[PDB]
């Protein structure tokens, strides 16, 4: 509710020259009243008359109706920024020491210097890549200051800090003026030509950080990073963070949580003295010195103060620094520079091959259908395939520039060009294009761009590999539904005064030219061993083709650009872009640690308690037959590093007894920590999202950060959403959508009216509007249909199906078509056509509805029904579980303190149902949860044919149809579908133990009848309600349910008719 | 305190109207204004909430949901930057193990639901909504409805209830002398409660389990969607958060899980009926006196359907009481066949956001 | 006036071009559409036995009463006669609508227990309801009242029809696939409405048969607890 | 052309401003959203055992078949294999779609009996179905076919997945709160789809647990028989 | 009242709950209009093509799965000349969610679709 009013301040603030609110309502009489009020308002304003009398004359509308949006009639130029900024340009502009960046262009020179001519300029090195403007950020920041220019006490101090800092930004920007952004939110050459090239991105990062300060320390930190970043743009993030790895080893462990036999976090009182060798301390001093010799002052001082007592109680600060260092921006260097950085392997490669074999040993001999029909599966998977060059195509009688790999298959099949048995050579003749991945505080890494023959020859094998990983704990990333918490508990588990932990950072090793030979040799060798295990042509064909991918790779040239020209150099290193990348990479990393660990054993005798891999990090807790001495840790670390050295591999091999740090999570003090640095006002790359989705994505990012540590002031975020959602109907009239429009659960929902809490239509208006929004949810694309009209699409679908179907498969057939018609929009002409057209419908939609033939039901409709049957009464819950994720906001942390947390994901795809397993056992097809849901809701007779249509044997198909297991399977499919619709696995809920004994007691539900469906929803609805109350009140409530037996049948029908609401931005899923 | 209702109607008339030109305002009608939706401002009779019973109300009801959530050309791009992706992933990496995306999808929207706050987003969404809203009143007739709500479910049950005049004596004294006579009359006959009706699923076994081990907290909606899943899927969800497998497996089968399926739905339904807010929070919905006025035979021990028929029965009787001063008794002969169709509908109800409706005072 | 004037802009534009709606909410329209295919209609006959007492009723309307009779009662369409409601009333003064009782009833036992406490029901008593068999039945009754409300079975001309007429009941044929009170209920009411409406628009009767599969009933059962409404109060025909 | 051109005006305006919709209809989106919160996901592992036979399938797609296998059959998605349908076919030539069978099945025994008669089924035979146990099961099967149709489980890439794979089934955990074939069915299918999709977008598997309360199941059961559709035929991927 | 009370409890009322839903569903599928009115939807021949196990005696869900099964098979027949057999393994958990949906289905008026000729 505060969002709608706040928006008024923002509009009045920006415009000084009318504001015509717009109210809608389910009530019919009120609605006409709303229209009268609206009509009179325009007339009064377009006649320069008051509006105070009208508002009094429509108190019913203000008080009883819903605000739909607020129109804004303006007539200036939106150049209020130039005028407002000057008041803050009092400070002295910053001067960048152009002598800081090893790479010339990394230095913050004058654009006209880095790019003398227009045809030479390229924002490719600083592009915020975000659909919001710098002026907007400046405008948004100014609005907050105007509003909090009179706050008192501590609130004021936040202002003084915010005021000070902002001045650095205002003062510097003012010197060169505020850069103007074009429709594409890019920054052209003329505006940029006389300004410090890295200005715009810097302002975003400085603004993002200064609007994230609260305590004094935040200020020094925001202040130091803000200033040094202006000149340093290549080591500030790396330097500020770097010491965090050594710091974790420093603190002891006073009580920590572990992983018990039931693989659930269990509080242990164990104590472990964090003992570190002398040399390790020096390593940390150098990190501090490097930080110091680089300009830093206060931040280094802070860590220094921390090291005097190294009290986990004062560790929170060390965390704020490591998280903050990331908000300095993205290191976007020239592609070539990024590309440029790139006998005793018998033991190493041997393990890689062997691991490959195990993952594919049983499947190969049996002649798994997946291996035999790998071509269809890979073909089907294309939707979840990488990306290829934006080729040229023709379908029917037109031309397009699609970059999606799946479409390439369509053009090629309908052109006799499709030839998967022949996987294009990736060498001098036909090199590999290139893609990239940027990340704060790390050298840019490149991404191959192999054709589709490569994905196809890799999907089945990798998929089969993963299943093995899925049940192997060594691969801490894949194992079961495991969440990062399980991984956290496993490490603390064996930690004792007779066991030292060892972590590494093999990121560079995965791209070390040295690595490619072994890596490829092992994969190919294993394929050879597997091939001499079967006599199946389909499998051997697949086993062989995969082998070739490695051979073509062994010698791969790269189409590396070097200006407006495309050079072409060699490349003896391995990069990402293959299916096997993430999976195979782990195999190698695991293979590497096994090799190093075994070799070091020659000297000291230990016991490998646990070994794990996780992308660019691999660790292990080894136990010693005696107490660990500083000398011992120093010796083992040396032996480990030298070993890594012998294999000529650049790595960060550290060793501790109580903590570990890695790219995804750091365990300092026995407590689990997560970094919180997701740049909010500077995106990595310019995707295909829209301004609206950009905002919902921004809010998602904000919540993840708040949950992890970093916290950008929510008022600022509200301001951005206000700027990002608004849309103009004229050149002097913008339409700012209301809070109800913005937060109501729909396909346009951007945020929540209370972070961490999701609401659902409870009032008539919310539902009235809720049903109304679904209407214009999916608007056809005058391209996505014609594409399915050409022989190409029809041949491709039929061609895929002809080898997938037998009977009348159309339920399956209808889905495949939309499977493509759902991604096809990607193609600019379709995403842009749909996005631009949506605005006309959306603008008109706010105008006048009242005419909708609703009939479809959703979670909103179902939940609204159950509400009246729940009787709430104050209940009490004591805090018993300790803390292990110290950064969690108090309200969130409180729930875990009372009901606990889970170290698992809640099955939300039906993957663990008997029917699914059967469909998988024989057919390669993979029906989504939605399909399983629709299929399960069918009659026994229909369901039986579905299985046959895919290939399940009739004896077996018939057994399922009757069997008791099928009935239960009907319950499980619904459960997965429901949980999916509640995002119970994403957001903050993924951190709550929804089966907590403590939470369960607070719910009271009598079994009117053994009806698993209804009993299930009443309970989950009961649990969510209690949790949400907890978050928004700090106190608990107990719910009672007396749902009549009659009502249950009506509700039961509703359960199998719930539709969805797409919006992917809501994505908060972080661990 | 009581401000004359006519005055309030006048304000709503002034506050809701919107201008399309400088000399043309569009005052929304009573049906548009009071029909239960995301734009619902009030009720056509204070203290009484209606639900689409006529074809027109439902026709318009499904139509309004359409333009309910309109994307923000800012709230999406924000999730497009490395910042949002890193923040979500960073939070998840220490929260997940398996394939958590059900949890992951929710977290993103958790932010995309508040992000609008930022003026450029709330204002952009609010201003854009007007164009869609104005046009919406113009011409619809083209909507691919398929989602069902409380309106659709309740509309189904109506025909199966047989109403007949009944009588209820006033026995409970007064203790909140200010309550308007029509409201006070209900308490005088059926009494009042000194408790809140569990409307979040907080008191369910699954929730407690998710809390006991994981710190995550899934809303009622998530518990509702999750509960509606297959035993196989639900088991992974618990693992994905951290619940121990020995314990996770015990819940999946256990009888308690089945009941928990009933309780999650109850909390979800009560939430959608605001049974805890408004004036209903002052009514003892389990009053012995109210219960007698309802007649429902157990066609089968199907806790879901028996539950809604009853609550629907109770609300109907209460509302009549408020708008008539006299009571009515309802009879229900819901066929066994109809119950299965209704049962499917129960696990597919969507919501309607409007937070203004907030009347929750004590 | 503001809502009414603004609605026109949206309404006019609405007729223009839609094709973009994220439907997910279900209503009576969606539920009934599902059941239709499972009903097998066949000509049946009903004799006129009840005399006339409201001579003004249009012949087509009067004909239904002549064959199946009429009621002198209203069909509980607010859940007022449910145990949970009575309990909420016995202790608290609050009065939750049918919609709220419907949403609340659709909740988990744990949540529902707190709701009662939150209003004031005593815990000893609140706990007794949550488990008790009566609560299960109450789940059925809340739904019945909600459904009847959505069918205006108490307003219009239907309020003059004895929907539990022995004569009407025979014309309907429904086997008990399972003691699932919810689905059996809707199939029946849907069966009754269909027969009555045919009577009004044809003067002759039809008999309906239902072979709803056991599998289909569970899908339908979910739909039942997710039906939304459609406000329009004008439809108000309730005269006696 | 008239519909297509007119749709543009409505569509353009639709993006502009909505906020005024009387939703009440429920769809798969609404039903699935409900079940999500009740599923507990946890990392699980699945080994590759089945060889390759369709070498072209993209690695992520091929991986699912390697672990859970594939089917050589289509999943009944029209209700064609139900007793009621066979009866309607045995005597009448009419052919009601899955939607009609779905709506008809959701009817009361009395109404369904007339439907059969109306088409020509003999009364002795029509009456036998209406009561018979087979009719109850038939209520389950009609829903199953309707649900599978809405999930395009037979089109797209899913048509290549063995959804009844023993390997996939183990990854799902669902306790029988009550022998309610409808809800148990959706929870399971929802469970299976979720696991499969995760597999495609991650290469690793997840195991799902479900503790759906008994109370929630009844609300969900109502929703099941009120799900509407979404026409778009382009989505047609059905190739083999 | 004596008679009204007898129905409210009576077993017949429970069944009546099933029948009302059946009629409502069939209406929404126009099973009586169009070309479907000429098809014996309870054909022994059509019934065999459908396979549905009784997860639980839940008449609502079993009903829709079956009708959905029958419509799918018939439609395939019309658009292919060949038949298909459908199998259904709907989990017990999913059935409850679906059961709720069943009692919340709304309509779609369009009377033109009227094909009812005999």
Coordinates of N, CA and C in Angstrom, one line a residue, chain D residues 155-207:
Chain D
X155 N 2.8 -35.1 -27.5 CA 3.5 -34.4 -28.6 C 4.9 -34.1 -28.1
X156 N 5.4 -32.9 -28.5 CA 6.8 -32.6 -28.1 C 7.8 -33.6 -27.9
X157 N 8.8 -33.4 -27.0 CA 9.9 -34.3 -26.7 C 9.4 -35.3 -25.7
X158 N 8.4 -35.0 -24.9 CA 7.8 -35.9 -23.9 C 7.4 -37.2 -24.5
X159 N 6.9 -37.2 -25.8 CA 6.5 -38.4 -26.4 C 7.5 -39.5 -26.5
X160 N 8.8 -39.1 -26.3 CA 9.9 -40.0 -26.3 C 10.4 -40.5 -25.0
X161 N 9.7 -40.1 -23.9 CA 10.1 -40.4 -22.6 C 9.1 -41.5 -22.0
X162 N 9.7 -42.5 -21.3 CA 8.9 -43.5 -20.7 C 8.5 -42.9 -19.3
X163 N 7.3 -42.4 -19.3 CA 6.8 -41.7 -18.1 C 6.4 -42.7 -17.0
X164 N 6.6 -44.0 -17.3 CA 6.2 -45.0 -16.3 C 7.5 -45.8 -16.0
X165 N 8.6 -45.2 -16.3 CA 9.9 -45.8 -16.1 C 10.1 -46.1 -14.7
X166 N 10.6 -47.3 -14.4 CA 10.8 -47.8 -13.0 C 11.9 -46.8 -12.4
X167 N 12.8 -46.4 -13.2 CA 13.8 -45.5 -12.8 C 13.3 -44.1 -12.4
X168 N 12.3 -43.6 -13.2 CA 11.7 -42.3 -12.8 C 10.8 -42.4 -11.6
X169 N 10.1 -43.6 -11.5 CA 9.1 -43.8 -10.5 C 9.8 -43.8 -9.1
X170 N 11.0 -44.3 -9.0 CA 11.7 -44.4 -7.7 C 12.0 -42.9 -7.2
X171 N 12.3 -42.0 -8.2 CA 12.6 -40.7 -7.8 C 11.4 -39.9 -7.2
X172 N 10.3 -40.5 -7.3 CA 9.1 -39.9 -6.7 C 8.6 -40.6 -5.5
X173 N 8.2 -39.8 -4.5 CA 7.8 -40.3 -3.2 C 6.4 -39.8 -2.9
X174 N 5.4 -40.6 -2.9 CA 4.0 -40.1 -2.6 C 3.2 -41.1 -1.7
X175 N 2.9 -40.7 -0.5 CA 2.1 -41.6 0.5 C 0.6 -41.5 0.1
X176 N -0.1 -42.6 0.3 CA -1.5 -42.6 0.0 C -2.4 -42.1 1.1
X177 N -2.6 -40.8 1.2 CA -3.4 -40.2 2.2 C -4.8 -40.9 2.2
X178 N -5.2 -41.3 1.0 CA -6.5 -41.9 0.8 C -6.6 -42.4 -0.6
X179 N -7.3 -43.5 -0.8 CA -7.5 -44.0 -2.2 C -8.3 -43.1 -3.1
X180 N -7.8 -41.9 -3.3 CA -8.4 -40.9 -4.2 C -7.7 -40.8 -5.5
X181 N -7.9 -41.7 -6.4 CA -7.3 -41.8 -7.7 C -7.0 -40.5 -8.5
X182 N -7.9 -39.5 -8.3 CA -7.7 -38.3 -9.0 C -6.5 -37.5 -8.5
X183 N -6.5 -37.1 -7.3 CA -5.5 -36.3 -6.7 C -4.1 -37.1 -6.6
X184 N -4.2 -38.4 -6.3 CA -3.0 -39.2 -6.3 C -2.3 -39.1 -7.7
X185 N -3.2 -39.1 -8.7 CA -2.7 -39.1 -10.1 C -2.0 -37.8 -10.5
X186 N -2.5 -36.7 -10.2 CA -1.9 -35.4 -10.6 C -0.6 -35.1 -9.8
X187 N -0.6 -35.5 -8.5 CA 0.6 -35.2 -7.7 C 1.7 -36.0 -8.3
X188 N 1.4 -37.2 -8.8 CA 2.4 -38.1 -9.4 C 3.0 -37.5 -10.7
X189 N 2.0 -37.2 -11.6 CA 2.4 -36.7 -12.9 C 3.1 -35.3 -12.7
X190 N 2.6 -34.5 -11.8 CA 3.3 -33.3 -11.5 C 4.7 -33.6 -11.0
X191 N 4.8 -34.7 -10.2 CA 6.1 -35.1 -9.7 C 7.0 -35.5 -10.8
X192 N 6.5 -36.3 -11.7 CA 7.3 -36.8 -12.9 C 7.7 -35.7 -13.8
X193 N 6.8 -34.8 -14.1 CA 7.2 -33.7 -15.1 C 8.3 -32.8 -14.5
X194 N 8.2 -32.5 -13.2 CA 9.1 -31.7 -12.5 C 10.5 -32.3 -12.5
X195 N 10.6 -33.6 -12.2 CA 11.9 -34.3 -12.2 C 12.5 -34.4 -13.6
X196 N 11.6 -34.6 -14.6 CA 12.1 -34.7 -16.0 C 12.7 -33.4 -16.5
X197 N 11.9 -32.3 -16.2 CA 12.3 -31.0 -16.6 C 13.6 -30.5 -16.0
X198 N 13.8 -30.9 -14.7 CA 15.0 -30.5 -14.0 C 16.2 -31.3 -14.7
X199 N 15.9 -32.5 -15.1 CA 16.9 -33.3 -15.7 C 17.4 -32.7 -17.0
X200 N 16.5 -32.2 -17.8 CA 16.8 -31.5 -19.1 C 17.6 -30.2 -18.9
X201 N 17.2 -29.5 -17.8 CA 17.8 -28.2 -17.5 C 19.0 -28.3 -16.5
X202 N 19.5 -29.5 -16.3 CA 20.6 -29.6 -15.3 C 21.5 -30.8 -15.4
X203 N 21.0 -31.8 -16.1 CA 21.8 -33.0 -16.2 C 21.9 -33.9 -15.0
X204 N 21.3 -33.4 -13.9 CA 21.3 -34.1 -12.7 C 19.8 -34.3 -12.3
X205 N 19.6 -35.3 -11.4 CA 18.2 -35.6 -11.0 C 17.9 -35.1 -9.6
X206 N 16.6 -35.0 -9.3 CA 16.2 -34.6 -8.0 C 15.0 -35.5 -7.6
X207 N 14.9 -35.7 -6.3 CA 13.8 -36.6 -5.8 C 12.8 -35.7 -5.1

